[PDB]
Design a protein around this ligand. Structure first.
Ligand SMILES: Cc1ccc(-n2nc(C(C)(C)C)cc2NC(=O)NCc2cc(F)ccc2Oc2ccc3c(cnn3CCO)c2)cc1
Length: 344
């Protein structure tokens, strides 16, 4: 049975939602959509609702819409956002033009937790453990997040964490994606692997330990300069792996920089935290630690449980290779909306 919908304007966006979702309030807004917090009067819990902006306006938007809904419908893990509800006011494919996605509202993002709580080393252990646990699951579905940063980590007052991706394309509480980006993806060095996300985790962990952005570059050139000042310039073995000629010629043109000893950078940190950082912030991603390996690191001895670090069910990404028209991406999305089944 179709719920009763109501309409409401909030910060210039028109929201049309089932009456179960009330007290809508803004969380974030950018070119691709907006997110509000609300109260779900069915369950008595707070939820976040994402409305895609004109999701079938172009091929790239239609495919993004479908990708997000496919992925959110698949994610079933404690440390990753999951889909509580997906709805449209439209009563048929013909009038389907808006998609809304619903998840459990977490207290805050990882930035706001730093303002509120004083993160001891135990807190850092627990928070990074959960990121890696969620990343192991995500990577096991052959998915790379690519956008990990503190604003994409949702945290409650109990310091329980979930990975999400706002996906709104915001630019200047601003947190730049580039500050957490591995150099090999930022500069298109080579066909990169899943451990670009581990680079991001290292940057986040560093910031949780020190209170400051590890590499706050103002553009990609300054970003790389800041990175190489810590980890040193690529040596011969890694340069040869930079298969982009333009990228390699640029790196080879820079003044060589020595690698720093992280024990002298992260003064007073748990030695095991320093050791993990040294394994995540490896320039050569063939040598960078994976999420599964990092979960086994002695830094996480208090939390690590190999029988409770689950992997994902097989995720069918054959849609990624298809070249479809807007109306075809729209119809596949509509199918996925209609087939959704709430979790129990
Ligand atoms: C084209 C594209 C775009 C994105 C993705 N993508 N990829 C992932 C992976 C699996 C890779 C991590 C996740 C997603 N997408 C989202 O995470 N979409 C956000 C979302 C979805 C909802 F259904 C409802 C609200 C949403 O936004 C929020 C915002 C803040 C929130 C919550 C909760 N707490 N808090 C903190 C404040 O209290 C939720 C894939 C493709």
């Amino acid at each position: 049975e179709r719920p009763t919908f109501y309409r409401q304007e909030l910060n210039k966006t028109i929201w049309e939602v089932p009456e179960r979702y009330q007290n809508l309030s803004p969380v974030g807004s950018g070119a691709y959509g907006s997110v509000c917090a609300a109260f779900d009067t069915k369950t008595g819990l707070r939820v976040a609702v994402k409305k895609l902006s004109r999701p079938f306006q172009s091929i790239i938007h239609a495919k993004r819409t479908y990708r997000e809904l496919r992925l959110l419908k698949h994610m079933k893990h404690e440390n990753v956002i999951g889909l509580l509800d997906v709805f449209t006011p439209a009563r048929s494919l013909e009038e389907f033009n808006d998609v809304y996605l619903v998840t459990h509202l977490m207290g805050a993002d990882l930035n706001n937790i730093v303002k509120c709580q004083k993160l001891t080393d135990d807190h850092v252990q627990f928070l990074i453990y959960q990121i890696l646990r969620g990343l192991k699951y995500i990577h096991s579905a052959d998915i790379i997040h690519r956008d990990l940063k503190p604003s994409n980590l949702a945290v409650n007052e109990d310091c329980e964490l979930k990975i999400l991706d706002f996906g709104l394309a915001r630019h200047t509480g601003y947190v730049a994606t580039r500050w957490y980006r591995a150099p090999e993806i930022m500069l298109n060095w080579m066909h990169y692997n899943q451990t670009v996300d581990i680079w991001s985790v290292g940057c986040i962990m560093a910031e949780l330990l020190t209170g400051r952005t590890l590499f706050p570059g103002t553009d990609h050139i300054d970003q790389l300069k800041l990175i190489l000042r810590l980890v040193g310039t690529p040596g011969a073995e890694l340069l040869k792996k930079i298969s982009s000629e333009s990228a390699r010629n640029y790196i080879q043109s820079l003044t060589q920089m020595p690698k720093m000893n992280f024990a002298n950078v992260f003064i007073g940190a748990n030695p095991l935290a320093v050791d993990l950082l040294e394994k995540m912030l490896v320039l050569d991603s063939d040598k960078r630690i994976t999420a599964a390996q990092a979960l086994a690191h002695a830094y996480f001895a208090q939390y690590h449980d190999p029988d409770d670090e689950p992997v994902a069910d097989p995720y069918d990404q054959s849609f990624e290779s298809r070249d479809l028209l807007i109306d075809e991406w729209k119809s596949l999305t509509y199918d996925e909306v209609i087939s959704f089944v709430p979790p129990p």
